[PDB]
């Protein structure tokens, strides 16, 4: 019988046993899957935590997911196609929810779906190994909660591990040196721990300006943004001063490529991630910056050196749960000898050409829409409910147009499900006064 | 034949100098490489403003904090080969910064000519053994070129210390708590917690020091709860103590007593666990911090696989020279030097120390085992032997400096086991000496 690893259990990993299981209520064999999850629940990132830098049995915290986090983009942009925002709550809400509420949401599916005894949690994947004598992969896992080390043999390995989770964490100048807070945005949990001090955010990433504007909505004194790159283009509040480069700093101040000076209490580094697969050697290991297309993936999920080995979710995300899904229905088609495999020289061709047309976008809206493009692909291969894509990327379009009109009000536009059609409202509290971040209070009609 | 040995922290530099003192009196050594995961050698010692995870993804290793001090009194780790005369030329007090005793260790080390050896930045990933090659084969991460590389060992030395990952219990309420929440592997900086009531979990040297350290450096209040034994410290009158942590909310702890109290910061001291994510269970070493962990046949050789050791692995009340005796051992295990007993022989052996283990109650106690331990592993090599009784004695002295005033013992000078000289006073009292240093230690201020 065919056995699947399926490393996480996070929203990648929801929808890989999700994709097999909807297969099942086809009527279709589907192998046995085994499912390997470090935390003690579901949700990845999006299982939040209070702890930080390694957890309760020694591992890397994962999620990098703090207080106070609402959808980053609008709701409508990220719904499932075949499990809608009607069904699980059973009313409309508003297009930015807490985490908490989009946590239950993903939830909802999986437990709907049933997938959860195919888990093993609390259970961090140690090692990934191709045996070439017989075509399986030994798969070492400790298991923390017997505190036991043991390995299974799989035909086929799909990894949901994430790649937002091991920070980049870059040093400057005088970091030995000062007196307060140093952390990546990994780390950074309460926004409560900064109220009445000036911030530090170093780099340009879409959490640096989520991060900054925690801080700012609840109570921190000032916040200095410095990056490399080019102006956001966004008008921060009066207390949010922008600067070039750090280049160094001292037990109390930051000094700047503007031979500028200023008083910091917390260096909050922004400074992105890096795709950390410590459970995989060099024939398995995915080595890539963070993009939208990544090389050695055929179709963006199947590792070209060993088309037995699958990771979902590596790309960079504009999209991203049904992404995941489409990357998963086609992980599942794949495996289950649906969908053919391509030569290897085809498939790293066919890569190619995913890459130089990457090469080519300048603009965000050239993005989404290559990416809007990339999962059109991954659905029309396989019985994936289709979806508008291109009224998605207009979706998108709006809440970038909102993002340019006003920085900290974006989270208060409402738009239309692209599945149901249905029209968002307004929700009860304005962003910069809904200090309260719980599912219960979302949810309430105060 | 081939050794690999895991870590440059002072173990992995105590085998390696082993090693090169089998050949500098004039033996046929084995070819040495030195997996370090760090860019630098020192281990715990040093020191990083980093938490977490590394500048590589690994687990940030360090415990160590601005403005800590040696812990006991030097003369307690002064090396025998290397006096303190010797190394800075001029007296000094008996508590020196975490800088100053660096700068000591370091100084045996370059003079040993040992990091020849050493493969820094350079993780280890996993180790195996192979019945059919009886060679282990270690998988290590280069983070300088990126790469992975598998190669074949005939002996393993696991150095990879036990103080760096942390047992992290949880309480109730601790999601909802406004304030920082760090065990004490991330405490970096005493002055992050000026005008800060911060709550101290769990009893420990260093539950005491990161409190001491806060205490030094302008925190508002400090208190500390945990479920062990008191010590009846004579704490200061900003310094609280009360009985073990039940919950928390926003902004408030909930004792034993049914007393609350604000806090702003909680730092969990709280221990730490043995974790060897590099290794399967057919040698990974799984034990609580104590005197004698169990599978360590005179504490080193692992018993299921006799090509494999752990340096250091035991608590730690004697350090510096409990690793060199540990690393002699070792290295002539590996040489041929000294044949092994039987596993059910090792076994018996193992068996008698834990029983003697069981039966400590008191710190004098506890030093004289650790003490009659490396007697031990000290008889059976070339290494010198040293006063352990005299060492005690000097260990127990700096106890009862702790327990006649915490805040003062480190103005206390104690006797060279290596000089007869007694140590001069330090020119600031350790409550006023804020700069850290090696230059500030160093000159006449
Ligand atoms: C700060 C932050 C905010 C974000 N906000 C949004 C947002 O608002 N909207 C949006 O659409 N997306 C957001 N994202 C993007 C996010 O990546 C996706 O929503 C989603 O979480 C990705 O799912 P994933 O399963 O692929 O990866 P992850 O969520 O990271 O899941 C990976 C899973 O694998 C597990 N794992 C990793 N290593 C091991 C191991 N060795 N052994 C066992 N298990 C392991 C982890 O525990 C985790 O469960 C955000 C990301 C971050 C970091
Ligand atoms: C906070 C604190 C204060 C202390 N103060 C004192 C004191 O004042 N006096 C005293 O005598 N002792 C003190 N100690 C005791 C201390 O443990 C010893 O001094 C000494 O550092 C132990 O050395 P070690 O090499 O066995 O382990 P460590 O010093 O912990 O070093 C282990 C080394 O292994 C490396 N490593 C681990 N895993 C890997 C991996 N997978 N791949 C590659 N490399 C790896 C690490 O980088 C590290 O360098 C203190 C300990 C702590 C935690």
């Not at 917390?266 to 990544?294: E, K, M, Q, S």
Request: proline fraction near 5%; glycine fraction near 6%; charge should be negative.
């Amino acid at each position: 019988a065919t056995r699947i690893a399926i490393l996480g259990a996070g929203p990648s990993g929801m929808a890989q046993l999700r994709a097999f299981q909807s297969a099942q209520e086809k009527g279709a064999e589907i192998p046995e899957l085994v499912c390997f999850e470090k935390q003690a629940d579901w949700g990845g990132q999006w299982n939040y935590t209070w702890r930080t830098g390694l957890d309760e049995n020694g591992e890397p915290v994962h999620s990098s997911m703090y207080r106070y986090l609402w959808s980053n983009g609008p709701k409508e942009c990220l719904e499932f196609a075949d499990y809608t925002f009607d069904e699980h709550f059973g009313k409309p809400i508003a297009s930015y929810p807490p985490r908490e509420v989009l946590w239950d949401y993903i939830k909802g599916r999986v437990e709907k779906a049933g997938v959860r005894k195919y888990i093993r949690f609390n259970t961090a994947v140690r090692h990934v190994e191709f045996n070439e004598d017989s075509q399986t992969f030994t798969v070492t896992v400790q298991d923390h909660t017997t505190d036991t080390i043991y390995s299974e043999e799989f035909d086929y390995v799909v990894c949901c591990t994430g790649h937002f989770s091991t920070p980049y964490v870059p040093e400057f100048e005088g970091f030995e040196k000062f007196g307060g807070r140093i952390l990546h945005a990994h780390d950074f949990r309460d926004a409560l721990e900064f109220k009445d001090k000036t911030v530090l955010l170093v780099g340009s990433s879409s959490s640096a300006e989520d991060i900054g504007s925690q801080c700012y909505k609840y109570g921190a004194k000032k916040l200095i943004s410095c990056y490399r790159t080019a102006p956001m283009g966004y008008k921060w509040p009066e207390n949010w001063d922008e600067r070039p480069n750090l280049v160094r700093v001292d037990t109390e101040n930051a000094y700047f490529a503007d031979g500028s000076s200023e008083k910091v209490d917390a260096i909050i580094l922004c400074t992105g991630y890096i795709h950390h697969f410590p459970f995989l050697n060099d024939d398995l290991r995915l080595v890539t910056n963070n993009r939208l297309w990544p090389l050695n993936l055929y179709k963006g999920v199947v590792w070209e050196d060993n088309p037995k080995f699958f990771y979902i979710g590596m790309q960079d995300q504009w999209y991203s749960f049904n992404m995941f899904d489409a990357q998963a229905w086609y992980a599942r088609d794949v495996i289950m000898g649906r969908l053919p495999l391509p030569s290897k020289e085809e498939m790293k061709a066919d890569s190619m050409a995913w890459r130089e047309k990457e090469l080519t976008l300048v603009t965000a809206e050239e993005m989404y829409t290559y990416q809007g493009d990339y999962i059109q692909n991954l659905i029309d291969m396989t019985d994936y409910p289709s979806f508008d894509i291109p009224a998605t990327n207009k979706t998108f379009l709006e809440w970038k147009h909102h993002k340019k009109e006003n920085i900290m009000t974006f989270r208060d536009h409402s738009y239309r499900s692209l599945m149901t059609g249905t029209m968002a409202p307004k929700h009860h509290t304005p962003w910069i006064d809904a200090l309260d971040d719980s599912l219960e209070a979302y949810l309430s009609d105060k």
